[PDB]
């Protein structure tokens, strides 16, 4: 009795949020889902890093259906640091657009540690993990929480397979302070009309972050959940200064590669 509509085909994603871990990848994808021309995968696929042997038909079948003109997207934050991922994504399509939501490497590292802490309460201290010798002097650049934050090093690998014009570096800090402004730039990059705007957001004082007045799936207000916007433990103040000192030259190189000063160093 009801009219059942064509929902279109499943397309491979024309744009992927490839990083960074704890940069604000869920927030960005959630906000983009408000747009009538966006369809997104929910959970992180981890195709190009973990499930690549399943093949592209399996990956395609994970995708939402789309009507003509809609963009298909997913986010997997580990892609950015996955050595094989640039070649593999280019093999799917050299024209894929890539979004990297970046964040102050120091708060990104603490966020990453705090995520582990929320699931494993008796992990070692952040300060012990920061140093080779677990006390001072030399920073353990091999520790994942520090290594992920050296964005210029990972970016080099991507630029061997993509032109930088196909990459957008989104400010995780501005995504919080001015979500509508940042989403304006994202919509431009994706070729989307600039529909997501200031009126889609409000500041939730209890959450401490922007929330959506309406989500794609909700007539009611939507904040991200308990795993988003965690209270960080306090980190030793001198350790923080040392980590900021370690990242500064790498940050400046990243500003030079991307053409933008993200403000993490004054
Ligand atoms: C409203 C509306 O509209 N609605 C609508 C819609 O809905 C939708 C929506 O929209 C959306 O939004 C949603 O989404 C969602 C999703 O889905 C979900 N998912 S799930 O899956 O979960 O489900 C979610 O998501 C989220 C979550 O939450 C999270 O979680 S947590 O918890 O974690 O937080 C996630 O996360 C993730 C991340 O991200 C990742 N990253 S990357 O980068 O990787 O990518 C990951 O991470 C992880 C990893 O994995 C790992 O690795 S491995 O390999 O290992 O595995 C890593 O690990 C590491 C760590 O971290 C470290 N640590 S530190 O500290 O350094 O950092 C290390 O660890 C270590 C330590 O250290 C030491 O200590 C230890 O030692 C030991 C141990 C043991 C022993 N014994 O045993 O004896 C001894 C000693 O060790 C350790 C180890 O090793 O382990 O290291 C490690 C490793 O490293 S390397 O590098 O070397 O490798 O990391 C990790 C972490 O975490 O960190 O993954 C993760 C996860 O994991 S698990 O496991 O947990 O699983 O994710 C997130 C995201 O975002 O994604 O949620 C969401 C949402 O949210 S909100 O907010 O937004 O709310 O969805 C939805 C749905 O879909 O439903 O729609 C719908 C539908 O519709 S349609 O139409 O479409 O159909 C509707 O209905 C509605 O209404
Ligand atoms: N509106 C929002 N609500 C909640 N978290 C937001 C947000 N906009 C940005 N974020 C950031 O998104 C981070 C998580 O990034 P990802 O989804 O890539 O793992 C959070 O880390 P914190 O928990 O350290 O605050 C938080 O700072
Ligand atoms: Na973590």
Author numbering: 141 to 406
Show sentences the authors wrote.
Heparan sulfate 3-O-sulfotransferase (3-OST), the enzyme responsible for completing this modification, is present in seven different isoforms in humans. The enzymes transfer a sulfo group to the 3-OH position of glucosamine in HS. Individual isoforms display substrate selectivity to uniquely sulfated saccharide sequences present in heparan sulfate polysaccharides. Here, we report two ternary crystal structures of heparan sulfate 3-OST isoform 3 (3-OST-3) with PAP (3′-phosphoadenosine 5′-phosphate) and two octasaccharide substrates: non 6-O-sulfated octasaccharide (8-mer 1) and 6-O-sulfated octasaccharide (8-mer 3).
We also obtained the crystal structure of 3-OST-3 bound to PAP and 8-mer 3 at 1.55 Å (ESI†). The complex was crystallized in a different space group but with a similar asymmetric unit dimer of 3-OST-3 containing PAP and an 8-mer 3 substrate. Despite the presence of 6-O-sulfo groups, this substrate superimposes well with the 8-mer 1 substrate, positioning the acceptor in the same position with respect to PAP. Notably, the presence of the 6-O-sulfo groups generate additional potential hydrogen interactions between 3-OST-3 and saccharides a, c, and e (ESI†). These additional interactions may account for the apparent increase in binding affinity of 8-mer 3 versus 8-mer 1. Surprisingly, the 8-mer 3 binds to the other molecule in the asymmetric unit in a completely different orientation (ESI†). A superposition of the two 3-OST-3 molecules within the asymmetric unit (RMSD 0.48 Å on 252 Cα atoms) reveals the other 8-mer 3 is binding across the cleft in the opposite direction from that of the previous oligosaccharide. The 8-mer 3 is offset such that the uronic acids, GlcA (saccharide h) and IdoA2S (saccharide f), now lie in the GlcNS6S saccharide c and e sites, and the acceptor GlcNS6S (saccharide e) is positioned with its 3-OH distal from the active site. However, it is located 7.4 Å away from the phosphorus atom of the 5′ phosphate and not in-line. This binding orientation is likely inconsistent with transfer of the sulfo group to the acceptor site, thereby, it is deemed to represent non-productive binding. A kink in 8-mer 3 is visible due to IdoA2S (saccharide f) being in the 1C4 conformation, as opposed to the 2SO observed in the productive orientation (ESI†).
